[PDB]
Nucleic acid binder design. Structure first.
Ligand SMILES: [Mg+2]
Ligand SMILES: [Mg+2]
Lengths: 42, 261, 255, 252
DNA sequence: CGGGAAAATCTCTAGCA
DNA sequence: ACTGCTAGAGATTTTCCCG
DNA sequence: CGGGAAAATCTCTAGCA
DNA sequence: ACTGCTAGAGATTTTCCCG
């Protein structure tokens, strides 16, 4: 017993875009026994 | 070595000779001489040669007062970026500190503040301010300024820039604000060739955006990885590898011996 | 301690008993229970065995019992001299890992030979009346039951010594009873395997040893040893005479 | 040395074993243990319930030795004479210490004696004469015989009568010599190997019947299964389930 | 040629001023 | 035109010893 | 593929406490 | 349970640009 609106909204609610976006960020980090920061990692 | 062990101990209670001395003199395997030294309470006089690493989470600030020309300067630094906030305060009081911290928290996201154990940071008024704004307080080990290495380094940087611009201003408070400006926007370097202002903006925006991106990704994407085990939740896959969160443990597994459901 | 051990300590303060509950029900290692009873001012107090004697039919029978399981080790002894009791105690010590023995003060146990036997094997002995002679009463009741057993078996053995051994075995294995009808053998084996696992558990418990020497704060002098509590990267937490301190790893030494 | 190491050395003088104890139990570095064994003149460097028995002679005295195949846990005692009756008595003494089920001998006259069969019966011990049918214990029995002879070869300096030296060697070989897989002394391994009881524990378990209404009826149930948040118990002619909050279990 | 442990070499710190 | 060094604790790499 | 210069990366210190 | 860092000066290595 769902209105056409309810089914429409459920249906409309791709991933490769968001994944490449997340993979675009640079990470500078350290290992737990080295004071130098390690170059940009993905 | 039974003979030499008794003699090296007698000589050690007089001389406290190091292990090479006992090994050369009394013909000992290096491990035995080292055991003689190790069990001497008077010969334990040196720490281990390493340095820790401070927390550089995106929400951590380090705070400290520094003194210049008889005035008190309350300096804060955002650890991840090198951005700084600083004001002359009338006295190193808990009240001035609560005020400074409230201003900082109302202008920037502040999850945790890390300070030494001075009377002003440990006070109940600073506690009440931190409770109101939702700020965790981390207290450094007493008499250990390296615990606040970043803000101590930044106090040096700020004193140098104040010295550079001192004769451009009458009062000290104005030189402090000129130096804050200069450091935040007129000095480039560090991880992304940034100034500290640019860098804090990037750090905070990156935090926001990645949070949103990955939240959406986990909402839409839903799987279960079985490796080697239980129903591990899938985090990432690629290049012959998978990332999983099995019982709050993240491990990198090769694609082989790993099946996704 | 663990929440279970703290609950056991609170139950002691409620009930004035330490070993009878946490060592058995709470699976506490015996070392911790011994330390607690030592600290407990209200507690005046697998390696336990007792040795005794009886004079059935004019002959001397010396009987050993493992207290925790109703096991029997017995032998008809030619004479009451300490020399032969030394030999038999040597047998008990060789066959099982026996740690302490409860006997009386009599010269049948205080003789030089028995002392040498304990010295060689590594056994402690108690001489006199135990704090709980009800255990002695229980083993005497077991002696009487063995005697009734003998009064029955002697229809089957030409030599009463052999019937004494027959009884030893009957009680070890065939006469299963108590809790869930278990033979002395089953309880013995369960207890000793549990003991092995408790040695391993005591090792892993005591792991979490370490002497820490440290430079105190603003003090030029180095102090220690302190007990290590927790080890991060860059800092440790240490117990120096009930005084928890946090020390950077640059200012500490862990042996 | 350390008090622990001195205690280990004294335990060696007491027990004629160096590496099997201080290298494992006392956490001594291997170099120190090797140096000690070099200085030590006394240190020259299936079906559980299956035991061997054999007869040995030494200095005009007869020694009967019981071995275990599954871990080399060795029992022994000096015998007054090689006669069969003494052998039967020793096998008797064996029966009550461990659930011996089947032994193997060398078909000797003193072992083929009838009284040996009689003891094996009334205790419930089976005899499998000849040589064992597994190609490990066949040389292992003689190897452990040699081990016992070697241990006595060092023990004898501390006992003028074999009757005590034999027990000294037996305790050494039972516990103070730790080795094999991970350094486990034969006694430990046999503890492990020996480790219906659980069935008989719950045979007579009756249950006071209750139901979801939480009543006090307490019907005459029989406990069928326990766990997973409830019980399974028969109600006269039918079967039901009851949560653990009710259905008290008692012995019949 | 292979491990494994023992020895030798390396990294890094406090504390002295 | 004068100048950081030393000794210890732990990490890492090399060498030696039985195979 | 070769130099040569320009840019990027590395080594190392004071000074803050 | 907590933890040295930062920015500049000079040395070294890498990369890019015309061949
Ligand atoms: Mg400060
Ligand atoms: Mg300061």
């Amino acid at each position: 017993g769902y209105s056409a609106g309810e089914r429409i909204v459920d249906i409309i609610a791709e991933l490769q875009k968001q994944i490449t976006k997340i993979q675009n960020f640079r990470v500078y980090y350290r290992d737990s026994r080295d004071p130098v920061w390690k170059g940009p990692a993905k | 070595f039974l003979d030499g062990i008794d003699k090296a101990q007698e000589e050690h209670e007089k001389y406290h000779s190091n292990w090479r001395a006992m090994a050369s003199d009394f013909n000992l395997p290096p491990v035995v001489a080292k055991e003689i030294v190790a069990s001497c309470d008077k010969c334990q006089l040196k720490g281990e040669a390493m340095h820790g690493q401070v927390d550089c989470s995106p929400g951590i600030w380090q705070l400290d007062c520094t003194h210049l020309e008889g005035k008190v300067i309350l300096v804060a630094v955002h650890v991840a970026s090198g951005y700084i906030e600083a004001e002359v305060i009338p006295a190193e009081t808990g009240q001035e500190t609560a005020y400074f911290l409230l201003k900082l928290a109302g202008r920037w996201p502040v999850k945790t503040v890390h300070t030494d154990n001075g009377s002003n940071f440990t006070s109940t008024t600073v506690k009440a301010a931190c409770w109101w704004a939702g700020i965790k307080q981390e207290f450094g080990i007493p008499y250990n300024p390296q615990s606040q290495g970043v803000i101590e380094s930044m106090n040096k940087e700020l004193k140098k820039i104040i010295g550079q611009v001192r004769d451009q201003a009458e009062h000290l408070k104005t030189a402090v604000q000129m130096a804050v400006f200069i450091h935040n926007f007129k000095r480039k370097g560090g991880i992304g060739g940034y100034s500290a202002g640019e860098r804090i903006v990037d750090i905070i925006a990156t935090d926001i955006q990645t949070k949103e991106l990955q939240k959406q990704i986990t909402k839409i994407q839903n799987f279960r990885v079985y490796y080697r085990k239980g129903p591990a939740k899938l985090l990432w896959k690629g290049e012959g590898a998978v990332v999983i969160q099995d019982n709050s443990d993240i491990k990198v597994v090769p694609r082989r011996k790993a099946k996704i459901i």
